[PDB]
Scaffold this active site. Structure first.
Site, PDB file in Angstrom:
ATOM      1  N   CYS A 237      11.725  50.481 -16.164  1.00  0.00           N
ATOM      2  CA  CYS A 237      11.040  50.592 -17.442  1.00  0.00           C
ATOM      3  C   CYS A 237      11.783  49.763 -18.491  1.00  0.00           C
ATOM      4  O   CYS A 237      13.007  49.808 -18.560  1.00  0.00           O
ATOM      5  CB  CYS A 237      11.029  52.059 -17.859  1.00  0.00           C
ATOM      6  SG  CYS A 237      10.260  52.297 -19.439  1.00  0.00           S
TER       7      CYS A 237
ATOM      8  N   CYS B 288      -9.281  63.275  -9.267  1.00  0.00           N
ATOM      9  CA  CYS B 288     -10.424  62.927  -8.425  1.00  0.00           C
ATOM     10  C   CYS B 288     -11.727  62.930  -9.237  1.00  0.00           C
ATOM     11  O   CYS B 288     -11.974  63.848 -10.021  1.00  0.00           O
ATOM     12  CB  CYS B 288     -10.525  63.827  -7.202  1.00  0.00           C
ATOM     13  SG  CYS B 288     -11.812  63.289  -6.042  1.00  0.00           S
TER      14      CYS B 288
END
Ligand SMILES: [Zn+2]
Ligand SMILES: [Zn+2]
Ligand SMILES: [Zn+2]
Ligand SMILES: [Zn+2]
Ligand SMILES: [Zn+2]
Ligand SMILES: [Zn+2]
Ligand SMILES: [Zn+2]
Ligand SMILES: [Zn+2]
Lengths: 309, 74
Positions: A148, A275
């Site tokens: 990062c 999902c």
């Protein structure tokens, strides 16, 4: 079009493109596998044979899924796969970039505790500057990578194909620099002759190293492994910007809906993580529908956004 | 089969055709065949990772046309 997934297409496109997800039965290798539940996260599609299903092909006992991605930009073969860049997301949360402070899409989300967000353009600049300054990290297990931009620990990129964002020539330099660093890590030396570029593991108990190798492998320069001269006798981020650029932690001003009525029977169904494939559990209904689009479940929603982050 | 490049640090690319299930050991044998370098003296490095003899290209997620670097161990 809602695209959840991105690949690097090294074929016609030579760029990060929206990807199409496909699934097959790992036994018969046909697109005949009905999943118990759809994938809800990247691990579900990246870890082979993780997901359970029932194969619909006659007499096939296959119960395990294998997923593949193709570039979404062009008619491809099933076997013309592209590499999924699993850190890249559509900026559905409108999170600002850690470095430029702009809302852009797509973004890359680091795997640090903070899930810091960088736009892909800033990501390109980050990679190029670190590469040129030799500030990529070499890790003996993960290879040559970067964490990062904020410096957060445990955040080295694991899927090195993300570095394809560099473009072909810079990526070649990336792999070259990675090789040199690996050599040095292993206790080897780099030939110091301008323009040679060789690296090797020298014999143990000798200060004289020669750049050995016929047919162009080496240049024959003899150097001192200590000083790297010709072999010789004798002694030689903005704090606020980072705060705002957090995929989860900076998204809480917007309500996250977790339940939606089945379009057909109107009974509330709980979403399973990321999902998008909703299955009504009502036995007389059993509608399957896309959380995102609202339509009956279909292969376009499957390929484009089976799940999201 | 799959085409890979085996690139010396001096910048020469050696094109090798491999089966995706070929062990790295087998890749080195292919390099020996083309270049005459004994496998024992080869180290293959992909994106900074030293590649183990018992793994396959697929273990390293290497794509068709990608480059493995070759380093000599004298
Ligand atoms: Zn493409
Ligand atoms: Zn099957
Ligand atoms: Zn940015
Ligand atoms: Zn971070
Ligand atoms: Zn040299
Ligand atoms: Zn010296
Ligand atoms: Zn229903
Ligand atoms: Zn949809």
């Amino acid at each position: 079009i809602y695209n959840s997934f991105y690949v690097y297409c090294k074929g016609p496109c030579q760029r990060v493109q929206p990807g199409k997800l496909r699934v097959q039965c790992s036994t018969c290798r046909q697109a005949t596998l009905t999943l118990t539940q759809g994938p809800s996260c990247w691990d579900d599609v990246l870890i082979p044979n993780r997901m359970s299903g029932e194969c619909q092909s006659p007499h096939c006992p296959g119960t395990s899924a294998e997923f593949f991605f193709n570039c979404g930009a062009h008619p491809t073969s099933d076997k013309e796969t592209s590499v999924a860049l699993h850190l890249i997301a559509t900026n559905s949360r409108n999170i600002t970039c850690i470095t430029c402070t702009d809302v852009r899409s797509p973004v890359l989300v680091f795997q640090c505790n903070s899930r810091h967000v960088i736009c892909l353009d800033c990501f390109h600049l980050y990679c190029v500057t670190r590469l040129n300054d030799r500030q990529f990290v070499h890790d003996p297990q993960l290879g040559y990578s970067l964490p990062c931009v904020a410096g957060c620990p445990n955040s080295l990129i694991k899927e090195l194909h993300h570095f394809r964002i560099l473009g072909e020539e810079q990526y070649n330099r990336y792999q070259q620099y990675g090789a040199e660093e690996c050599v040095l890590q292993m206790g080897g030396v780099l030939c110091p002759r301008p323009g040679c570029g060789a690296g090797l593991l020298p014999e143990p108990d000798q200060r004289k190293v020669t750049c050995e190798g016929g047919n162009g492998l080496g240049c024959g320069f003899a150097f001192c492994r200590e000083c790297k001269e010709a072999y010789h006798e004798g002694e030689c981020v903005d704090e606020r910007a980072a705060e705002q650029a957090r995929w989860e932690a900076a998204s809480k001003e917007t309500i996250k809906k977790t339940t939606k009525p089945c379009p057909r029977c109107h009974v509330p169904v709980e979403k399973n993580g990321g999902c998008m494939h909703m299955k009504c559990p009502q036995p007389q209904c059993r509608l399957e529908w896309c959380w995102n689009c609202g339509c009956e479940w279909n292969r376009v929603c499957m390929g484009d956004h089976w799940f999201d982050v | 089969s799959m085409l890979i490049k085996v690139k010396t640090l001096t910048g020469k690319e050696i094109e090798i055709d491999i089966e995706p299930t070929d062990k790295v050991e087998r890749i080195k044998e292919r390099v020996e065949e083309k270049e005459g370098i004994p496998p024992q003296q080869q180290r293959l490095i992909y994106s900074g990772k030293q590649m183990n003899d018992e793994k396959t290209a697929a273990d390293y997620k290497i794509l068709g046309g990608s480059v493995l670097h070759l380093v000599l161990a004298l």
